[PDB]
Design a protein around this nucleic acid. Structure first.
Lengths: 147, 422, 266
RNA sequence: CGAGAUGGU
RNA sequence: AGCAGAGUGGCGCAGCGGAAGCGUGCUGGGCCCAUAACCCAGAGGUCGAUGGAUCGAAACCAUCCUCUGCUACCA
């Protein structure tokens, strides 16, 4: 299987396409993990560091997240099988990088970590601005600027 | 060598591989560690023969059946004759012209090295297809009237939509070219009717005049094959130029030169640029080596140069001749010009900025073409019909009769008109 | 058998060992460079910080690096420690052990001559040649492995003493079967692309002028990553000596086209 | 002064 | 074509010239009233062809084979 990057658009010819995101449920009750297997390839296909899309699930779900250089596992704590992610797999696009003028997420970020500001720019119609101040992930991005 | 050379010309999304194989037996290609797309996007070739039996048909190299291989579920077949002995009509080879308007300079060069055009048509976009003016208006301005039309990808298209295509084209050409080019229909998947293309390249196209004894002239476009293996790593074979001889007999050991050559290092500008010259080391045509050559045919010419010039087509659109030849070399240009009556390149159900071209200004860079070359032109002085410019690389011609002009009217240059030297 | 000059280890240096059992006060161990003699590591000497399980610091049959903290010569008692050992000293211990295991693998096989009835022949073959070849060098830090490497390039080392033919050939083979890939260790990188319209004749000097006064038979090896990135091998010399030939070759490669009306970055 | 969360019948 | 990896003993990561190598996954047992954390033990075994030193060859060294990786070309 393969998919469009976002499911709010039903078009077969939509500009954005990517591999599936698949995960393992591991352990037993009071200590369950969900580990995301494709995360480095999905982060490469979306042109972002793999910390940002992993951190967004913990911000929405109300859950802990882990990262590890010794084992390369990316983890969201608790059981999040099937619909518990797959109803909202669009979200890292749908709550950040859709343009309000047109539904075309051909979109870039630049971080000014010395001055508490994240700049945003979409190629599709020239839309520019910043990320939202009520939204969760802004406090993580300013402490973790892009490569 | 050859008697005539034919340019296969078209637009995006019309295909290439099946029809270029059908007229020649050869797959047009460029080597890359990557998938083959719908088009060969940049100028190429296909080597060929045209032959018959005693009765009109185009056989396979085994003469008894025309049996196909382009579709997995069927074997379309006919008998040209009961294993009859084949007869060659004439020696021919194909110029595989660019598949996209992005390469329009290289397309005008391809249309100048051919003696005649095949123009290719397909059902994949709306009826009034615009390249039917864009090629043929320039081809008439470079005085090459020899034209044919070939309707390729129509395997699932009804006869009324195939009509509406050629009839809206027949209405559209009224301001840009004469209607007098025959149309041949084929199937792209089944190889149906393809031998009528072979018959029409005998029926429509004449052998053109050339001087066999006047001073040598050659056009070069291609970096021909040189390969990595060797016990000596530099200069084992030397660089080979692919081209077509315009004028004069040619021989091995003759000194030959390229007119625009190169700008000398440590020069402060356009001064001290010079021709480049050497003895011809070998010759190639029709899958044979040669000692001698003639005007009017595609040929490979061997030279002493570094193969690092040949690992890509650096040699696109160059004019060559005998060492110390007369024809004037231009690094700056005096111009007079005229612009097209519509903006051109693509079309749909109604107007998309198709109005007349806005006048030129000095704060801009043109792409400008002469003979079978190309260069970038920067303005010293201009008016809406006339100007004076300086060139990012030199160019040459035997007479200043014509130029073709392209402007940055959007992100990449489009043709907007033509002109002459003053 | 013993691998070294002396009957017992010296204090405050590192030995290679193998673990045999674990008890209430410590682990019992056999030293490998000595003839399997007994010593022990106390449980207080395993770590600077709290131990979650002992089985993941030590388990039976694994080889290990430790210091000798105390010795009594008369009773044959040796105390060992692991808290002390730095990772550089563990690498140094593996080098001493590898240089010793290779020499011992020669001498144990060379001993399979004459009657070979007892370990007396092993101790007699260890004495004289192999012992006088490194007793002189204990302070500089060499072992008989270096004397064997000298005996490979010139057998006059062996001719200086009473000798056997296995002791000559097995010694040489346990170096040469590993040393014979004396492979290429320098190549040049050059950015040159050639201006010369006579190149198919003229560049055949630049391909061949790279060293003076050779035989007519002398080869060189030439390579290419891509056409503008020319590469050459410096007469198969090692990286300790070929640096002069590297600097000369790249100068000659540019000279034999700058002599011929070319110009390039120096 | 090592680490010591949680709760269908 | 230059340089590098792989060729399971258990998914997956590929150690070092000693017959699993360690962090991890799977399966079972202990501890607790019980679940997680923690602790311990299991898994039928020449790892593509042809030569050579060894107590020994997936892992010391030649010569062939094939696909990837980065460069980037006999096509």
């Amino acid at each position: 299987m393969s998919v469009n990057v976002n499911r709010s658009v039903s078009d077969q010819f939509y500009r954005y396409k990517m591999p599936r995101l698949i995960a393992k449920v591991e352990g037993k009750g009071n200590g369950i993990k969900t580990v995301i297997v494709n995360m480095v390839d999905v982060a490469k296909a979306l042109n972002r560091p793999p910390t940002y899309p992993t951190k967004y699930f913990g911000c929405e779900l109300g859950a802990q997240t882990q990262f590890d250089v010794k084992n390369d596992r990316y983890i969201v704590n608790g059981s999040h099988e099937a619909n518990k992610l797959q109803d909202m797999l669009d979200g890292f696009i749908k709550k950040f990088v859709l343009c309000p003028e047109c539904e075309n997420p051909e979109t870039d970020l630049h971080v000014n970590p010395k001055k508490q500001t994240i700049g945003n720019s979409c190629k599709a119609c020239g839309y520019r601005g910043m990320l939202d101040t009520h939204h969760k992930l802004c406090t993580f991005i300013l402490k973790n600027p892009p490569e | 060598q050859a008697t005539i050379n034919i340019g296969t010309i078209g637009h995006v999304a019309h295909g290439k591989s099946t029809v270029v194989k059908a007229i020649s037996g050869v797959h047009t290609v460029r080597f890359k560690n990557e998938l083959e797309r719908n088009i060969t996007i940049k100028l190429g070739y296909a080597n060929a023969k045209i032959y018959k039996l005693d009765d009109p048909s185009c056989p396979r190299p085994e003469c008894y059946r025309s049996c196909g291989s382009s579709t997995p579920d069927e074997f379309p077949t006919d008998i040209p004759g009961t294993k009859g002995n084949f007869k060659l009509v004439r020696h021919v080879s194909f110029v595989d012209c660019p598949g996209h308007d992005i390469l329009m300079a290289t397309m005008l060069n391809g249309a100048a090295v051919m003696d005649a055009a095949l123009l290719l048509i397909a059902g994949n976009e709306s009826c009034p297809q615009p390249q039917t003016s864009e090629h043929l208006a320039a081809i008439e301005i470079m005085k090459l009237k020899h034209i044919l039309i070939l309707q390729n990808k129509i395997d699932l298209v009804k006869e009324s939509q195939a009509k509406e295509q050629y009839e809206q084209i027949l209405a559209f050409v009224q301001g840009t070219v004469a209607e007098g080019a025959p149309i041949i229909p084929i199937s792209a998947q089944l190889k149906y009717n393809i031998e009528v293309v072979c018959e029409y390249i005998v029926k429509k196209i004449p052998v053109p005049p050339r001087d066999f004894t006047s001073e040598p002239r050659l056009i070069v476009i291609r970096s021909f094959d040189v390969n990595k293996p060797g016990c000596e790593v530099d200069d084992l074979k030397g660089g080979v130029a692919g081209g077509s001889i315009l004028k004069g007999v040619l021989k091995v050991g003759q000194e030959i030169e390229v007119r625009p050559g190169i700008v000398s290092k440590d020069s402060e500008g356009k001064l001290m640029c010079k021709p480049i010259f050497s003895k011809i080391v070998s010759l190639f045509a029709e899958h044979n080596d040669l000692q001698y050559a003639a005007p009017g045919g595609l040929i490979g010419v061997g030279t002493k140069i570094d193969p690092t010039l040949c690992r890509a087509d650096r040699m696109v659109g160059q004019v060559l001749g005998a060492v110390g030849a007369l024809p004037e070399i231009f690094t700056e240009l005096e111009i007079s010009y005229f612009l097209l009556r519509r903006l051109l390149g693509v079309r749909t159900e109604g107007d998309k900025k198709a109005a007349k071209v806005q006048k030129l200004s000095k704060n801009e860079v043109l792409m400008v073409n002469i003979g079978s070359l190309s260069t970038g032109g920067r303005v010293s002085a201009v008016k809406a019909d006339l100007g004076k410019i300086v060139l990012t690389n030199p160019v040459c011609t035997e007479v200043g009769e014509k130029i073709a002009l392209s402007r940055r009217v959007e992100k990449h240059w489009r043709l907007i008109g033509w002109g002459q030297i003053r | 058998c013993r691998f070294y000059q002396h009957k017992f280890p010296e204090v405050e240096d590192v030995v290679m060992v193998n673990v045999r059992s674990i008890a209430e006060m410590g682990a019992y161990v056999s030293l490998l460079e000595y003839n399997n003699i007994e010593g022990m590591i106390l449980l207080s000497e395993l770590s600077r910080r709290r131990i979650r399980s002992i089985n993941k610091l030590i388990r039976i049959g694994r080889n290990e690096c430790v210091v000798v903290i105390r010795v009594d010569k008369e009773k044959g008692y040796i105390d060992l420690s692991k808290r002390r050992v730095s990772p550089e000293e563990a690498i140094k211990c593996e080098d001493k052990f590898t240089k010793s295991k290779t020499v011992y693998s020669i001498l144990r096989h060379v001993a399979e001559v004459l009657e070979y009835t007892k370990d007396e022949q092993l101790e007699s073959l260890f004495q004289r040649t192999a012992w006088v070849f490194d007793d002189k060098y204990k302070r500089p830090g060499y072992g008989a492995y270096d004397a064997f490497k000298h005996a490979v390039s010139d057998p006059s080392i062996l001719d200086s003493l009473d000798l056997n033919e296995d002791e000559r050939e097995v010694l040489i083979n346990n170096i040469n079967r590993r040393l014979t890939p004396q492979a290429v260790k320098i190549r040049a990188d050059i950015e040159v692309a050639c201006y010369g319209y006579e190149g198919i004749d003229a560049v055949k000097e630049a391909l061949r002028a790279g060293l003076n006064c050779s035989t007519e038979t002398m080869p060189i090896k030439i390579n290419l990553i891509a056409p503008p990135r020319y590469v050459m091998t410096t007469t198969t010399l090692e990286r300790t000596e070929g640096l002069s030939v590297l600097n000369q070759a790249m100068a000659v490669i540019k000279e034999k086209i700058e002599e011929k009306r070319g110009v390039f970055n120096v």
